[PDB]
Design an enzyme around this catalytic site. Structure first.
Site, PDB file in Angstrom:
ATOM      1  N   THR A   1      32.847   9.078  82.805  1.00  0.00           N
ATOM      2  CA  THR A   1      33.841   8.506  81.893  1.00  0.00           C
ATOM      3  C   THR A   1      34.263   7.296  82.090  1.00  0.00           C
ATOM      4  O   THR A   1      34.377   6.631  83.220  1.00  0.00           O
ATOM      5  CB  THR A   1      35.019   9.470  81.876  1.00  0.00           C
ATOM      6  OG1 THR A   1      34.836  10.711  81.719  1.00  0.00           O
ATOM      7  CG2 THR A   1      36.163   8.970  81.206  1.00  0.00           C
TER       8      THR A   1
ATOM      9  N   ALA B   1      37.213  17.907  83.560  1.00  0.00           N
ATOM     10  CA  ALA B   1      37.660  17.989  82.268  1.00  0.00           C
ATOM     11  C   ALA B   1      38.809  19.070  82.322  1.00  0.00           C
ATOM     12  O   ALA B   1      39.607  18.764  81.628  1.00  0.00           O
ATOM     13  CB  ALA B   1      36.569  18.452  81.331  1.00  0.00           C
TER      14      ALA B   1
END
Lengths: 244, 212, 243, 250, 231, 4, 240, 195, 235
Positions: free
Chosen positions: B1, B49
């Site tokens: 990410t 996440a």
């Protein structure tokens, strides 16, 4: 259930007084008088033993005056057994502080914690309060010489000269009469004995019915010495002032 | 990410990529990595996440209870410290979160706090967090000035994610833009890298490594 | 005075008035009996039909413990259920550790010690039930009756409730007239008669008869309810004796 | 269930009296006379063995108990309360001292621990005070010989000599006349027997009198040899025979 | 008198006055009627309002798809006991894949109410319950009293002037028990029963509360315009 | 589980 | 643990233990709080039946909770120490988590919350203490004065008094304090505080304590001579 | 975290603390202040495990600030160091110990003396004329052994400190982005803005 | 003495009945529910003129869609509000939605009877819980220390309650506008209040679907008081 037999030790009267604190103070008012007098160069602790018997061992006895650490002592008025519980707690609190900070406990901090324990017994737990009043005589490098008293309510106050136990009314009038601020230890010793001598319920004040202690800086250079007087030392100080 | 937030004259710019991966598998390219805690508070997500999503959602509940109890919007410092104190309780448990708490309040002004799962809490003007944080930093640092316009700042934030989205195998999908002012956060749209890359390449004349 | 206001308090007599007061609640209850027989025990109880609206055969008062013990009680019915629930826990933990099903004397003391425990503190109320129970173990048949005090003995016949004196008088006759022993099928019929005779002390409302039995020969040492033909046979026997 | 009595059963009356301590002292007053006399080279503690029945074996009931090899205790008041205090006193000598310092506590400190237990019964939830006054005689290297009284309140006083229970008033007056600071242990035993005869009404012999001393070390009573420092217990209970010998020269 | 201070004390005649005072709270409560056939079980409850501005206190609670009760007395106590039943019904489902028998439901309430009557500090439950249900042995109606006494009945009523409805059902017993495969006719019999407990007031649309469970009918409550059919 |  | 419900309702709908706790406050030495335009002043009575006192070491009637908030009280002295300690801990706890010192309202709300908890907690009696909490919110110059009482109710006051003969000094403040124009300066606010105590006290010697709190953690206690000057000034103006 | 130095001179204690906060292959910040003021005349610098460092520093700060309010009195640097050591001494035998190493630089107002205490995460306290934590010591201790004098002024102490930072910038593998320097003396704590 | 959880011979809990007497002594609080919103109004009742009346917080926000007014021992209400706020926010966290006004009230009323020998006594405070949800629209609830809650079209609690409730009986209809309800609360408060009603000794609030729960400014309430007096003199 058990509700039937609960005295409810921690409640208010309609007038807003704590019954058990008031009755514990009434208990202490019958205990042998204990006087603390704070001079500019030391503190005196005097205490009258409760109607002594001629066969009581006087030299190896400790009723009134106890040592908390090397810098702090207390005079007791009330139940001796109750006092010893609180003294052992105070002695541990002093060593806990030393262990943590590597410095001797300031007098007020020790007095506050002991007073806070007494307060607890008046607000929660449903137990009777400690039937004890203390006169704390101690020294620290912040405030120097300090006198305090605590009572079953857990309220504590600072003093220049104070009495607890029997005939405090009469004792406090005589101290308030003859005390002054520039007083020396040797003068405070004389005042303490003269006060007890007049307020005593006994015929005449003698060495065997007295406990005596001084906290001077009378050691060698900028260090405090505690002196718990021996029977022979009380006999000498009683003749020296001319009471016997 | 890849997530970045930087402070400038116009306020705070927050840009995040939209991709989530499990190993080399691309799980999704359509993930909201910015949480809107309230009108003046933004939360950025990197690492696990579930961890980021769950605890940043939970924070929003704690921020709401603060303004009910205190009749006043929580400070960015207090909001960030609730999260940093929470993850610190779980330190060693294996929580993996790299987050930025971005907001405006009257007493603070525009503020960014970096908060990660080993308990680090840092106030700062520029942060890039993720696998492609270095790729974002490269473009952002080399073009950053305090006097950027709202238009230029928004583009640099977008271009910095695109840079990482390209080179970093584990960054991509789309760029989600936010602009935080004294009046609160403003959403500046979702930008698919699929179209954005060729649009930028052509217009900018950059990405000469790629077969045009 | 005031010695009766708190449980576990000795009166100057040496009595626990709260336990004696719990007995009054038992005396107030419906009649329940136990009859020890040749190779087992028989339990019977009076069920007062308060209203036509009571569903017949669907307000069962006799309870089973483990698979071999039967329990019946007079007085506060909920207190009785609480005692049986305890009995079932005691019997389960005994079987768990020792494998064998709990012997009746062993079981009797497990209830006895528990009921006695409720006379030791002012924070608990004594049990408002006399409990008649028993069954078949390795040593044969045993009948017991347990009282609010925690007092229990082995019995040839037991009775408690409003018609206890009537039932006791009828039980004493069976013990005298059958010294060698009473058979399981006989005891069931006698149990019916004694409940019908003991109903004279509770004759405003008409009642419903309920019988159970453990028997080494008849029920194979397990507790079973007397239902259908055997029940109607016992009712008809009892109906014939009152007239 | 559970102890719902988590509140004090001992509280201050308007007058400032602690009723349950005063009533505990009344129970001690009713109790049989016991006394203690301190000599220069030992201590003696004595009491009458009030037999509940002539069928009862008064040897089995020990009113004078060993707490440590160098400390003994006697009481006046309720025997059962005394028995559990001796059990607790023996254990606290180990747990709170011997298991820490590898030596037995000095008399004053063990007395202090017993006093603490009795004080807690005065203040703790759902308990009455102990209905006994203890006389604890003991020796230790740094304090020498000592005698202590412990009251239901948890208060303790050191004595040269004293008595507690039934005829304590008369017994104390008797001891005052006889006691001096030059008494040898044998002279203190002689006075103890004279004082106790006044309070005792029925039979007065070694079977109705229980008497123990804290004197010299008894190597014979140690049970082993080889360690020079271990010289044996100073506590010794006088036998029924040893008492009767001294009652002839009375 | 001297023996009503707490639930742990017996009276000299062997009474528990705190349990009897808890029983008194039910009599003060609004009337509710229970009755069943062989196919269906019906609850009918007269709901009570504080005044004309207030709502009508909801008397009927659902416990499972096949079970539920009506209340009379302290509504919070009914909420505690109903919640306990929901858990016991739910435990039976998850662990044993088994619908809880209405008889066991009664036994569990009895044992829960009992523990409050034998321990110091606690108090008896101040509510009566009428539990209806359809299980593997057909339709059922239970009457719970906070003494712990649970009774299985064809029909009954609890609350103020419940004696009127209870006398009617005692007369009608033979009629309403055989209303099989007809929900609407069993409800009518229940609505006619509760009408015998009315004084000055009559059954209105937001006043009447009806519940039903049966063979091919999950436990469903009818309030407002749904009960207008039966006035 | 996923990462971002 | 001791469980007894000591604080309970009476038939007339009163909680006598809370009302008897107020009687303990009414017995306690008078304490007065007067907030000016840019300051708050806490005045406290000290009964003069105690001579041979040591005023160096004797617990002061006004206590600092943080560098910017103070707490005076009337009632049981021992009880006050427990409230003060809890408040001081909560003050540091707030700085640690919120990265900002407490507001006077928040600190009051906490202390009031503690006092309330003891009125419906088993095994405890209410605090025989009413408190005057005064100070300035962080980066704020608006004076704050709050009162708490055993019941747990708290409210903001332009000026308020608590303790013995508090009704007499409240009577005084009610006619002498103007809402439209509070004491503009420190001197005016201190004088009005001393004046209000001189209605009740006896002598203006070592019987009156005055503590002045100003914005940005500016708290100072006045000495005997400083207070004695106000007493001397008021008495000379009175003789008219 | 990494570099924290301390030099006690005649009339003051000087704490230098690196400004770099590195995680992975990224320097996240280059202006980090690795210090908390415990009381007006007591400063504590810290270095070690991420999160633990600040969490520990602020916890100590809160406790000392609470003591200051309660007693209306400032604890001596000796007293504060003893308190901090005991907290770390407790910590090391905890389930998860604080992996934080600290320097406590204070000015004792009663003695009129500067005091520097070096405490590691085990609770190993030592009073020193100069201290360092981590790899910094391996360079600075030998350098200070040579150049340090006990009667130096604050200005001489800062020049001695510059000599340390220069040696570290020359021979240390990692870029620690310079140091924040703070001086503890009779007038309290102040920060040198240009170093 | 006697148990805290004891029943009277009539079949009521003594401590609950005595707490109701405490609520009667409390300051008046009135709630009126319309199809345009729910209005909450309270008597502040400052014990002394020195007490800053705006610090009297007897109307409180639970969530954006739920408000609350109180009467009686108002100190007791603090923990009840705290619970309500947590319940409301916690439900939003678990279900990503607003919580039903009835479900919130039921959550507060579950505390009420959690007393005995849990807390030592019942609450000495009644709550008017006003709110809006998508299901049942605008709602007003009276939450007592008994653990019971009624829904009301209008309700008064406190010292002037029986007099105010009789007045609300006549005045309320199902077609009241929000503005009509505001004046009606002000009108009935002025009737039952000892001291004369103004913007400093009386507070208004409302909850509307659009703007949520809003406590009115002293400026806004003052205009409604002036509007009320003119309309009463106008006939």
């Amino acid at each position: 259930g058990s509700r039937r037999y609960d005295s409810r030790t921690t409640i208010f009267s309609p007038e807003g007084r704590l019954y058990q604190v008031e009755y514990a103070l009434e208990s202490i008012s019958h205990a042998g008088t204990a006087i603390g007098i704070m001079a500019s160069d030391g503190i005196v602790l005097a205490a009258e033993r409760k109607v002594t018997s001629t066969l009581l061992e006087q030299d190896t006895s400790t009723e009134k005056l106890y040592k908390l650490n090397d810098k702090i002592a207390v005079a007791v008025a009330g139940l001796t057994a109750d006092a010893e519980i609180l003294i052992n707690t105070a002695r541990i609190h002093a060593q806990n502080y030393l262990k943590t900070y590597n410095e001797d406990i300031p007098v007020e901090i020790l007095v506050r914690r002991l007073s806070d324990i007494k307060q607890g017994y008046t607000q929660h737990g449903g137990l009777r309060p400690f039937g004890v009043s203390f006169i704390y005589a101690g020294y620290d490098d912040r405030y120097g010489y300090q006198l305090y008293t605590s009572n079953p309510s857990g309220n504590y106050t600072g003093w220049k000269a104070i009495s607890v136990g029997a005939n405090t009314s009469a004792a406090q009038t005589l101290l308030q009469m003859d005390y002054k601020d520039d007083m020396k230890v040797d003068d405070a010793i004389e005042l303490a004995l003269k006060t007890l001598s007049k307020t005593t319920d006994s015929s005449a004040l003698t060495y065997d019915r007295l406990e005596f202690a001084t906290i001077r800086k009378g050691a060698n250079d900028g260090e405090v010495y505690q002196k718990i007087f021996k029977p022979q030392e009380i006999k000498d100080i009683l003749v020296k002032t001319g009471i016997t | 990410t890849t997530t970045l937030a930087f402070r400038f004259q116009g306020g705070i710019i927050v840009a995040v990529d939209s991709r989530a991966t499990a190993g080399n598998w691309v799980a999704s390219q359509t993930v909201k990595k910015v949480i809107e805690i309230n009108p003046f508070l933004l939360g950025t997500m990197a690492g696990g996440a579930a961890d980021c999503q769950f605890w940043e959602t939970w924070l929003g509940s704690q921020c709401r209870l603060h303004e009910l109890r205190e009749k006043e919007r929580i400070s960015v410092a207090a909001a960030s410290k609730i999260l940093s104190n929470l993850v610190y309780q779980y330190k060693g448990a294996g929580l993996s979160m790299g987050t930025m708490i971005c907001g405006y309040t009257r007493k603070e002004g525009p503020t960014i706090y970096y908060v990660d799962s080993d308990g680090t809490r840092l106030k700062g003007d520029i942060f890039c967090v993720g696998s492609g944080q270095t790729f974002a930093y490269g473009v952002l640092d080399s073009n950053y000035k305090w006097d950027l316009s709202v238009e230029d700042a928004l583009y640099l934030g977008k271009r910095s994610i695109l840079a990482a989205a390209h080179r970093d195998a584990y960054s991509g999908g789309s760029v989600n833009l936010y602009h935080v002012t004294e009046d609160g956060w403003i959403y500046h749209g979702n930008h698919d890298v699929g179209e954005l890359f060729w649009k930028v390449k052509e217009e900018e004349g950059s990405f000469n490594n790629v077969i045009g | 005075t005031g010695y009766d206001l708190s449980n576990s308090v000795f009166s100057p007599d040496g009595r626990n008035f709260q336990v004696e007061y719990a007995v009054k609640a038992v005396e107030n209850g419906t009649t329940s009996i136990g009859i020890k027989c040749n190779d087992g025990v028989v339990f019977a109880v009076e069920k007062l039909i308060t209203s036509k609206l009571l569903v017949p055969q669907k307000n069962v008062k006799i309870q089973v413990v483990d698979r071999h013990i039967g329990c019946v009680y007079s007085g506060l019915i909920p207190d009785g259920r609480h005692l049986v629930n305890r009995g079932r826990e005691e019997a389960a933990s005994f079987k768990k550790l020792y494998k064998t099903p709990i012997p009746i004397p062993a079981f009797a003391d497990r209830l006895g010690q528990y009921v006695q425990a409720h006379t030791l503190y002012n924070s608990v109320r004594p049990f408002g039930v006399s409990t008649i129970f028993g069954g078949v173990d390795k040593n044969g048949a045993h009948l017991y009756m347990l009282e609010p005090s925690g007092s229990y003995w082995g019995y040839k016949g037991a009775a408690t409730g409003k018609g206890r004196q009537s039932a006791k008088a009828e039980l004493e006759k069976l013990v005298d007239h059958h010294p060698e022993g009473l058979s399981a099928r006989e005891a069931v019929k006698q149990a019916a008669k004694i409940i019908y005779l003991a109903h004279e002390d509770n004759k405003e409302k008409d009642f419903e008869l309920e019988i159970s039995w453990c028997s080494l020969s008849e029920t194979n040492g397990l507790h079973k309810f007397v239902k259908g033909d055997l029940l109607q046979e016992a009712i008809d026997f009892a109906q014939k004796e009152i007239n | 269930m559970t102890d719902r009595y988590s509140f004090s059963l001992t509280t201050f009356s308007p007058s400032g009296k602690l009723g349950q301590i005063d009533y505990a002292l009344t129970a001690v007053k009713q109790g049989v006379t016991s006394l203690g006399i301190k000599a220069t080279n030992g201590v003696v503690i004595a009491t009458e063995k009030k037999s509940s029945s002539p069928l009862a074996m008064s040897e089995t009931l020990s009113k004078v108990s060993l707490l440590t090899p160098d400390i003994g205790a006697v009481y006046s008041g309720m025997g059962p309360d005394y028995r559990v205090l001796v059990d607790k006193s023996r254990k606290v000598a180990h747990t709170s001292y011997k298991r820490i310092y590898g030596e037995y506590p000095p008399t004053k400190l063990l007395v202090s621990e017993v006093a603490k237990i009795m004080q807690e019964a005065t203040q703790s939830g759902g308990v009455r005070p102990f209905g006994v006054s203890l006389l604890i005689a003991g020796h230790d290297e740094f304090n020498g010989f000592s005698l202590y009284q412990v009251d239901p309140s948890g208060s303790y006083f050191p004595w040269k000599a004293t008595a507690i229970g039934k005829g304590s008033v008369a017994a104390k007056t008797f001891l005052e006349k006889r006691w001096n600071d030059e008494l040898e242990l044998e002279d203190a035993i002689h006075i103890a027997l004279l004082t106790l005869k006044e309070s005792v009404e029925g039979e007065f012999n070694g079977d109705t009198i229980e008497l123990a001393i804290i004197g010299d070390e008894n190597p014979d009573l140690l049970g082993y040899t080889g360690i020079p420092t271990d010289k044996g217990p100073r506590f010794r209970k006088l036998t029924s025979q040893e008492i009767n010998d001294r009652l002839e020269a009375l | 008198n001297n023996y009503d201070g707490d639930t742990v004390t017996f009276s000299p005649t062997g009474r528990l006055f705190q349990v009897e005072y808890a029983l008194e709270a039910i009599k003060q409560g609004s009337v509710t009627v229970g009755l069943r056939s062989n196919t269906h079980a019906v609850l009918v409850a007269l709901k009570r309002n504080a005044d004309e501005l207030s709502s009508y206190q909801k008397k009927i609670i659902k416990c499972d798809e096949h079970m539920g009760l009506s209340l009379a007395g302290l509504a919070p106590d009914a909420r505690v006991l109903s919640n306990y039943l929901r858990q016991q019904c739910n435990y039976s489902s998850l662990v044993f894949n088994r619908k809880l028998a209405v008889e066991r439901a009664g036994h569990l309430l009895c044992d829960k109410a009992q523990k409050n009557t034998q321990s110091y500090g606690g108090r008896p439950y101040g509510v009566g319950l009428l539990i209806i249900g359809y299980d593997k042995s057909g339709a059922h109606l239970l009457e719970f009293q906070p003494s712990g006494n649970v009774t299985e009945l064809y029909g009954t009523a609890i609350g103020a002037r419940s004696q009127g409805a209870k006398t009617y059902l005692e007369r009608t017993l033979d009629t309403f028990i055989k209303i099989d495969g007809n929900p609407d006719e069993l409800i009518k019999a229940g609505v006619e029963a509760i009408s015998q407990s009315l004084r000055d007031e009559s059954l209105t649309v937001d006043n009447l509360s009806i519940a039903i469970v049966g063979k091919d009918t999950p436990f469903t409550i009818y309030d407002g315009e749904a009960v207008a059919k039966y006035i | 589980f996923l990462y971002x | 643990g001791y469980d007894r419900a000591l604080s309970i309702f009476s038939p007339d709908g009163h909680i006598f233990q809370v009302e008897y706790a107020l009687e303990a406050v009414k017995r306690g030495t008078c304490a007065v709080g007067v907030k000016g335009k840019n300051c708050v002043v806490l005045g406290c009575e000290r009964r003069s039946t105690l001579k041979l006192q040591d005023t160096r070491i004797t617990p002061s009637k006004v206590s600092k909770i943080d560098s910017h908030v103070v707490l005076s009280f009337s009632g049981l002295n021992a009880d006050s120490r427990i409230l003060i300690e809890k408040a001081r801990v909560e003050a540091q706890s707030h700085r640690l988590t919120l990265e900002d010192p407490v507001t006077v309202e928040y600190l009051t709300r906490y202390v009031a919350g503690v006092q309330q908890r003891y009125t419906q907690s088993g095994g405890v009696r209410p605090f025989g203490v009413s408190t005057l909490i005064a100070g300035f919110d962080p980066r704020d110059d608006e004076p704050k004065l709050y009162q708490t009482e055993p019941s747990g109710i708290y409210s903001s006051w332009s000026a308020q008094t608590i303790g013995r003969n508090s009704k007499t000094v409240r009577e005084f403040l009610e006619k002498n304090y103007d809402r439209k124009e509070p004491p503009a300066t420190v001197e005016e606010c201190v004088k009005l505080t001393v004046r209000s105590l001189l209605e009740v006290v006896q002598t203006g010697a070592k019987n009156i304590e005055i503590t002045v709190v100003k914005p940005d953690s500016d708290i100072v206690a006045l000495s005997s001579e400083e207070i004695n000057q106000y007493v001397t000034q008021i008495e000379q103006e009175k003789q008219e | 975290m990494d570099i924290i130095l301390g030099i006690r001179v005649q009339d003051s204690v000087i704490l230098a603390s690196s400004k770099a906060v590195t995680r992975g292959i990224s320097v996240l910040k280059d202006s980090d202040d690795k210090t908390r003021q415990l009381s007006p005349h007591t400063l504590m610098s810290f270095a070690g495990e991420a999160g633990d460092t600040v969490q520990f520093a602020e916890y100590i700060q809160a406790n000392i600030q609470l003591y200051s309010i309660r007693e209306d009195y400032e604890l001596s640097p000796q007293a504060v160091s003893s308190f901090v050591r005991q907290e770390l001494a407790k910590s090391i035998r905890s389930r998860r110990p604080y992996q934080v190493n600290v320097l406590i630089g204070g000015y004792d107002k009663k003695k009129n003396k500067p005091e520097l205490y070096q405490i590691d995460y085990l609770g190993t306290k030592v009073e020193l004329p100069y201290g360092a934590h981590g790899y910094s010591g391996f360079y600075t201790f030998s350098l200070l052994d040579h150049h340090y004098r006990p009667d130096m002024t604050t200005e001489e102490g800062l020049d001695l400190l510059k000599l340390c930072v220069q040696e570290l910038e020359k021979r240390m593998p990692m870029d620690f982005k310079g140091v924040i320097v703070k001086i503890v003396d009779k007038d309290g704590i102040r920060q040198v803005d240009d170093f | 003495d006697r148990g805290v959880s004891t029943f009277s011979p009539e079949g009521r809990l003594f401590q609950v009945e005595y707490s109701l007497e405490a609520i009667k002594l409390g300051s008046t609080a009135i709630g009126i529910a319309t199809k345009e919103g729910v209005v909450l109004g309270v008597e502040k009742r400052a014990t002394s003129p020195l007490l800053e009346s705006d610090s009297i917080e007897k109307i409180v926000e639970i969530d954006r869609h739920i408000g609350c007014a109180m009467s009686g021992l108002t100190a007791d209400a603090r923990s009840m509000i705290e619970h309500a706020r947590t319940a409301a926010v916690t439900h939003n966290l678990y279900y990503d939605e607003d919580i039903n006004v009835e479900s919130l009230t039921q959550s507060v009323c579950d505390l009420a009877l959690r007393f005995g020998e849990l807390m030592s006594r019942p609450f000495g405070v009644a709550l008017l819980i006003a709110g809006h949800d998508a299901d049942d629209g605008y709602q007003l609830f009276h939450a007592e220390p008994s653990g019971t809650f009624y829904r009301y079209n209008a309700k008064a609690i406190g010292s002037g309650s029986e007099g105010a409730q009789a007045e609300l009986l006549n005045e309320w209809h199902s077609s009241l506008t929000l503005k009509e309800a505001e004046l009606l609360v002000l009108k009935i408060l002025k009737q039952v209040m000892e001291e004369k009603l103004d913007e400093n000794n009386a507070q208004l609030s409302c909850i509307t679907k659009q703007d949520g729960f809003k406590i009115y400014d002293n400026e806004k309430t003052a205009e409604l008081i002036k509007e009320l007096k003119e309309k009463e003199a106008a006939e």
